[PDB]
Amino acid sequence: ARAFGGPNKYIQRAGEIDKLAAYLAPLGKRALVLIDRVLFDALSERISLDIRFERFGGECCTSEIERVRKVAIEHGSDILVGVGGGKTADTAKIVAIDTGARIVIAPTIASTDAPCSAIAVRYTEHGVYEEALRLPRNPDAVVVDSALVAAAPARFLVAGIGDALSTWFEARSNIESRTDNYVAGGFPATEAGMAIARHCQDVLTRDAVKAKIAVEAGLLTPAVENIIEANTLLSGLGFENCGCSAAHGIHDGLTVLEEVHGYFHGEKVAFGTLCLLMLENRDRAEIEAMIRFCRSVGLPTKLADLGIVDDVPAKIGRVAEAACRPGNIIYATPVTITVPAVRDAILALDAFSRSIH
Amino acid sequence: ARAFGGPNKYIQRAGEIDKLAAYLAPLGKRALVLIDRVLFDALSERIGSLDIRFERFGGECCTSEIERVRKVAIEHGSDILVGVGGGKTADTAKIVAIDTGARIVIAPTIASTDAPCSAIAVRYTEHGVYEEALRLPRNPDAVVVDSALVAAAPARFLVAGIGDALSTWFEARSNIESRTDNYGGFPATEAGMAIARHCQDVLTRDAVKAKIAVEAGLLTPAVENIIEANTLLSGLGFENCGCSAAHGIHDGLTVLEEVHGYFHGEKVAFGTLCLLMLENRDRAEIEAMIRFCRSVGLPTKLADLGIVDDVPAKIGRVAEAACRPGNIIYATPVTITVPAVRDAILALDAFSRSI
Amino acid sequence: ARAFGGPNKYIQRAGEIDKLAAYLAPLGKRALVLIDRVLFDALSERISLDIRFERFGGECCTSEIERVRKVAIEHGSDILVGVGGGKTADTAKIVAIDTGARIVIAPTIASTDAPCSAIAVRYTEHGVYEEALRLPRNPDAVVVDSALVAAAPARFLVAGIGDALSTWFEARSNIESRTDNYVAGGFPATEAGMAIARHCQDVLTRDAVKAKIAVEAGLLTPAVENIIEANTLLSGLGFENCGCSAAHGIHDGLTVLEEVHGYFHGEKVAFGTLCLLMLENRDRAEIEAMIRFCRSVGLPTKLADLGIVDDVPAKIGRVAEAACRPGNIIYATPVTITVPAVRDAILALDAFSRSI
Amino acid sequence: MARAFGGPNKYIQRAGEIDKLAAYLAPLGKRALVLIDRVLFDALSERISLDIRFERFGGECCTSEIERVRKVAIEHGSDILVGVGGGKTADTAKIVAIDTGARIVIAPTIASTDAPCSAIAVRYTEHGVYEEALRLPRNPDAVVVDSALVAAAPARFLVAGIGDALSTWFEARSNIESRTDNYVAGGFPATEAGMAIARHCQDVLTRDAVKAKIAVEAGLLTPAVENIIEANTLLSGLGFENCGCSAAHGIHDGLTVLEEVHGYFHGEKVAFGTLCLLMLENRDRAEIEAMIRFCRSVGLPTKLADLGIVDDVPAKIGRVAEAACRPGNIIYATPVTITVPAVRDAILALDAFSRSI
Ligand SMILES: [Zn+2]
Ligand SMILES: [Zn+2]
Ligand SMILES: [Zn+2]
Ligand SMILES: [Zn+2]
């Protein structure tokens, strides 16, 4: 067996948010449009069909899922639309599967693999990982407005680089462990998925630095565009069709630490990728090359870079217990997983990183 | 700008046909299941919240059959069009669903073309002369590939599939070098290009292994890889990167009666080799592609598609149809004229006859 | 975790059978020296400490393990000594573990990986695979008289190459599936073990043609010595320390067909190795090179080379069911193992080999 | 035309395996004399059908101690000698096992040398001057390596092991080029198995040494540490016994005549002696340099000053060289013509070359 899933339609073009309504119309009659707080005003202005606009509470947790879900039943919504980062998108997704509504995602930032996948992640109200839901349907359409996306602070693009950085390495773990992907109901990876995942790593090495340099200067270039697709299309297609591993599992456990709450999903995953490499005891040169790559774009490569500086061995112990709960994605790793091993991998990565100047 | 499209689900596993009903249920309530004739009886048995009407497929994706089949959907009030056959069945279904606003599920019974995954349906005259490639606004909702069903078909169909998939990387490279748009048509996505390229590697790695396997009536991982490459890889590459002279020459070849009995992919395999000549690629790349084609038994000379009499005049005719304004062959990164096309084809046959 | 096991002493020199007692002396005071039938007469004469000499029956099966055991108890046997092929040795080992006797193996042919290993394989009285006993000790000394091994017909040396050939490939299956080896109840493979399995393949491709040609002309050269070592020491260490997989599993299943009874362990395993490759869908070039390598020394590469020619799909169905019993070694393969998957891999390999 | 291989009957490497050691003794005898290093005697005697007398090691492998232990064993009527310590504890245990007809089990507490596997026990004068290397007729029955116990020692002991494993391949290569016999059964050419193991040892060190060091300095046990523990114990032990020693162990032996070098570990001296071998055989500049750099990456000594040797150096090196070149010594396995000046001068030249890097 083997199985692939992806969005019916991915489109990436500057200004495309002005024509967003024109993608909704063929899909439903009643659209609930959910828009991150910061941009709720201008994108309500700017966006046979009526739109209810709702404002997004910031976190993907049960209370907000529920609020928005109740909004939708009353609306009678045909279509859930997510217009924000990954938390907004996942919320629209979860509300959609629950409603029977079609899904459209228009990211406003390229900071995570969430917009393309069938997976939605729920946190507590304090942003502690709760549960990854494997949905049955990918989105109907993903509509990325490059200009919009390239306008955000530079840190949002770098954080997507760091989340996309896990893709190839985590696919490599699932191939070596022969573990299923989350494409419903879960199956071995397709050659298609393996290729996307491999190619995602290549696009990042070729363009990341050039893209980071360009957004910092308020510019939108072909390098930025390549990175937007790598952060969004290649990464989501990869992670969904190949599987997650210890990079994401370590992101999950990192969420138990409060000091970490203000760092982006993509920066924790970047750090978690570096830990996956040490856990699987990869080549020193590969680990060092990834460390230098992360440093070159400003992603974290030491515990200290994610605010973890006091009582570190005890904290990491907590991170590792939470990652290692029976059933978790970290068990996709072609290594024998114990808490001591995951805890000692994170600390060893940290130390080895601390020795590189 | 860039765009990527594909089906929402692709699932490939032995036995899946028996579970096809269960992929229809989440999509609607009234499914119209269009099946190829050879298999109508047996597949209607196995396929039969959800209500199905089964129809027999005539064989051509032509207007009389499309419109005949649409009238049957409107009566049934169908929610879901299911193509169950080869690429004509598939394309028939897709065009009806779009005309009907129904959802689309394809369940191929052979792995002989890249039709099952794409937004492209090709309509032929009732005789099988190319009329029109319709760019549809949706891709399939699900593609459900039953590996055992596909594998037990005569080897020729898997080989015709390798033939069709062979155009993928080479056509994508044609499109990437002319910066023409993929078929809802934008420049190619990175994902698209990476898919296309990978398709060529899977074929070279596994093609001879698969062929040998199916000729002995076996299903192996080499077969499964080829089935994926013939359907998922080939389909995603072609839509997301574009087609070129290989399919143009295919389409041109349809104007000749004596080619009618050959499989789409056998025609496309020949056209790929002509594409290489048209673009004047390396002697060694052309030769190795000729040798790869012969090793699985795909055609490499005009005589292999039976064209043996009045050849220049016929190839002239083929080139004319291929070169009509607006056609896909203009995606070639070369200056396309009817002589260039006609002489590439003849040149390729000449060069192939010299090996 | 990781573990390694091996014999305590491995000595390989022409004429060493004359010195066998000198190796027994320190191991005990009373040795039962089990010898194959062909060589029973000559080697007993050639071979302080007293030794009963028991003739060996041919099969390592329970009726015959028990016979030899009784003799051992009667003897008061201190050291079990196995002088012959793999079956002779497996018996001797099994008796030894039953008795708490020490172990010495003195192979007279280099046709299998048995002499160094902790593994004894039991067959039915008619030679159908029964059970792979994993023993708690390796031999105390393995003593290899090169001159005696190289004097045997060339077929026996080629059968060892056949067996050794599976070592790297089956090690690789186990590494890629992370399956426990056969050391002390089973652990991950040691680096030492992986290095040995790897080198085994290197010595075989380097020296197997030259050794085959040397033994056919009646010669003992350094290339023969190298192959004797790989067939015995490298191949045993690699197998025991890295594990087996579908190549031995398919050999085991082949044992159920009568027509294959005549072929040697090694020629069966050789063929199973090619099947493992097809089963893992390994690169075509690699499958081809190993086919050409098997033909260049006369090892089987088709179903017909094993006598399998009538009703083949049904017979391979049977070999596959037998190989795919629950808990069998074939599951060490980094592939999803089913009877159809195994059956069609053997068939596919057969078809692919028939087209070269 | 002849070859031979010898090795331990079992080698087991797992964290906490010290607790189960008694379970490995049962099958070999009824009566075990357990000889433990000074530092861990208390703690390990209490962690460790069967009757065991416990004895604290003197700390040097020398005749007074061997005799003493030997009398303890006879009084006890020991069936098994177990050395639980470093290579001296191990080597004392073996000599007494062979004089006593006991079986031999070794449970290293540090991975500081390649003694635990081999049939070679080295005797020193009471003050630590090299005295005799005895080739025993038997290898250990079992080597039991408790990875947590070994990894919790100070980093210097693992670094010292790496120094001693570093010589394995270089000395096998000397012995292959001079076609000198090994120390298996009276002496035979290297088996292909021995040669492969020794070469592999060197690959394991280079891949994993720096990651193992960083890890144990952080008080961690990771897979790099596991690999290096095997490299220092199993690989280096099999390689050495099966291919022979040369001038690296010869220069080590000579060094022990100098009082000042007394506080330096066996493995730190062998590291330096291996660099000297390379100069003695006039190996490639780039190979000598890459080893120097490699020793420095893990903090092994690469100059005479690093062994504290800074006054009257030519004269002292003169004394080191005389002692190594005593007739019959293992330095004669080097594929160079061995004289006192050649060795004296290879050492000095290596130092001078190393000061220029
Ligand atoms: Zn993510
Ligand atoms: Zn086509
Ligand atoms: Zn065998
Ligand atoms: Zn040493």
How far is Cα C285 from Cα C296, in angstroms, rounded to an integer?
16
The answer to whether C312 faces chain B, any CB pair under 8 Å, is no
Rounded distance, CA A160 to CA A171, Å?
Answer: 17
Distance, in Å, from the CA atom of D66 to the CA atom of A236, rounded to the nearest integer, reads 68
B8, C170, C174, C181 from C332: Cα distances, Å: 35, 9, 6, 10
Which two three-digit tokens encode residue C347? 């068939």
Instruction: Map residue A56 onto helix, strand or coil.
Output: strand
- Measured distance CA(C297)–CA(C284) in Å, rounded: 20
Residues ≥6 apart with Cβ < 8 Å to D264: D301, D307, D308
The yes/no answer on whether domain C152-356 falls in CATH 1.10.10.10 is no
Sheet of strand D103-106: strand arrangement: C2-5, D10-13, D142-145, D103-106, D80-84, D31-36, D51-56
Q: Do D220 and A348 touch (CB under 8 A)?
A: yes
Token pair 């069911």 is at which residue?
Answer: C321
Neighbours of chain B (3+ CB pairs under 8 A): A, C
Alpha-carbon gap, residue A343 to D222, rounded angstroms: 10
DSSP structural state of residue B181: P
B108 vs B94: CA distance, rounded Å: 13
The residues placing their C-beta within 5 Å of ligand 2, an ion, are B 164
Dmax of chain C from CA atoms?
62
Contacts (Cβ under 8 Å, ≥6 apart) of B210: B158, B162, B220, B222, B223, B225, B226
Q: Of A278, A254, A255, nearest to A344 (Cα)?
A: A278
Binding-site annotation, residues of C = 86-90, 108-111, 113, 117, 123, 163, 248, 265
CA A237/CA C13 separation, integer angstroms: 61
Distance CA B119, CA B134 (A): 8
Residue D229 Cα, gap to closest chain A Cα (Å)? 15
Residues 6+ apart with CB under 8 A from D157: D86, D110, D111, D112, D265
Q: Are C91 and C65 in contact (CB under 8 A)?
A: yes
**Residues forming beta bridges with residue A131, ordered by sequence position:** A122
Interfacial A residues in 89-148 facing D (CB < 8 Å): none
Dihedral pair phi/psi, residue D18, rounded to 5° = -65, -35
Instruction: Tell me the chain B residues in contact with residue C351 when contact means C-beta distances shorter than 8 Å.
Output: 212-213, 215-216, 218
List residues forming the annotated binding site of D for glycerol.
114, 164, 249, 266
| Cα D154–Cα D157–Cα D162 angle in degrees, nearest 5 | 135
Amino acid in position D204: V
Spell out where chain B has E strands: 2-5, 9-12, 30-36, 51-57, 80-84, 103-106, 120-124, 130-135, 142-145
Instruction: Check CB contact under 8 Å for D218 and A345.
Output: no
Nearest ligand, CA D166: 4
How far is ligand 1, taken at its centre, from the CA of residue A253, in Å?
Answer: 14
Q: Which of A78, A140, A145, A163 is catalytic?
A: A163
The number of helix segments (H) and strand segments (E) in chain B equals: 15, 9
CA distances from C107 to B47, C90, C182, D169 (A): 63, 11, 22, 31
D228 shares contact with chain A (CB less than 8 Å): no
Look-up of token digits 């005898």: D29
Q: Of D154, D41, D166, D20, nearest to C1 (Cα)?
A: D20
Least Cα separation, residue C348 to chain B (angstroms): 6
Specify the 3-state DSSP secondary structure of D120.
strand
The answer, for C8 touching chain D at a CB cutoff of 8 Å, is yes
Per-chain residues with Cβ under 5 A from ion ligand 1: A 113, 163
Angle at B129 between CA B124 and CA B134, to 5 degrees: 30
Instruction: Reduce the DSSP state of residue B59 to 3 states and report it.
Output: coil
Nearest-CA distance from A346 to chain D in Å?
10
Do residues D8 and D143 make contact, with C-beta atoms less than 8 angstroms apart?
A: yes
- Alpha carbon distance B208, B296 (integer Å): 6
Instruction: Provide CB contacts within 8 A for A319, sequence distance 6+.
Output: A250, A253, A254, A256, A257, A342, A343, A346
In C, which residues are within 8 Å of A331 by CB distance? Answer: none
Nearest CA in chain C to B224: C281
Q: What are the sequence ranges of the domains in chain A?
A: 1-151, 152-357
What is the CATH number assigned to the segment(s) D153-357?
1.20.1090.10
**Which two three-digit tokens encode residue C241?**
């320390």
Residue C3's φ and ψ, nearest 5 degrees, are -150, 155
**Residues of chain D found within 8 Å of residue C190, distances taken between Cβ atoms:** 11, 13, 230, 234
Q: What would the two tokens of residue D247 be?
A: 């001038």
- Report the CATH architecture of A1-151: 3-Layer(aba) Sandwich (3.40)
| Letter string b/e over residues D266-302, b meaning 16 or more CB atoms within 10 A of that residue's CB | bbbbbbbbbbbbbbbbeeeeeebeebbebbeebbbbb
Q: What is the C-alpha to C-alpha distance for residues A100 and B201, in angstroms, rounded to an integer?
A: 40
Q: Which of D139, D192, D204 sits opposite C191 (nearest CB)?
A: D204
Q: φ and ψ at B52, to 5 degrees?
A: -105, 135
Residue type, D183: Y
Q: Counting Cβ atoms within 10 Å, is residue C90 exposed (0-12), middle (13-18) or buried (19+)?
A: buried
Q: What H or E segment, with its residue span, contains residue D83?
A: strand D80-84
In the sheet that holds C102-105, the strands lie side by side as C50-52, C30-35, C79-83, C102-105, C141-144, C9-13, D2-6
**What single string gives the DSSP state of each residue in A137-190?**
---SEEEE-HHHHHHS-HHHHHHHHHHHHHHHHHHHHHHHHTPPBSSTT-BPPP
B191 to chain A nearest CA, in Å? Answer: 6
Q: What are phi and psi of C85, to 5 degrees?
A: -95, -165
Q: Which ligand is nearest to the CA of D252?
A: 4
Domain B153-355 has CATH 1.10.287.620: no
Q: CATH for A152-357?
A: 1.20.1090.10
Looking at the domain D2-152, which fold is it?
Answer: Rossmann fold (3.40.50)
Q: Retrieve residue D180's tokens.
A: 């000198």
Which token pair is A244?
A: 């997650």
Rounded-to-10 torsion of CA B100, B104, B109, B114 = 100
Rounded Cα distance between D246 and B191, Å, is: 58
**Residue D133 — φ and ψ, nearest 5°?**
-105, 115
**Cα–Cα dist D333/A152, whole Å:** 70
CATH of B1-152, picked from 1.10.540.10, 3.40.190.10, 3.40.1080.10, 3.40.50.1970, is: 3.40.50.1970
User: Which chain B residue is nearest to residue A147, measuring alpha carbons?
Assistant: B1
User: Is D252 a known active-site residue?
Assistant: yes
Contact between B47 and B33 under an 8 Å Cβ cutoff? The reply is yes
Annotation marks residue A207 as catalytic: no
In sequence order, which ranges of chain C are alpha helices (DSSP H)? 20-24, 37-46, 62-75, 86-99, 146-151, 154-177, 191-216, 222-229, 235-242, 246-254, 265-279, 284-296, 312-323, 339-354
Give the H/E segment covering residue A79. Answer: strand A79-83
Q: For residue C64, report the distance from its CA to the centre of ligand 2, in Å.
A: 66
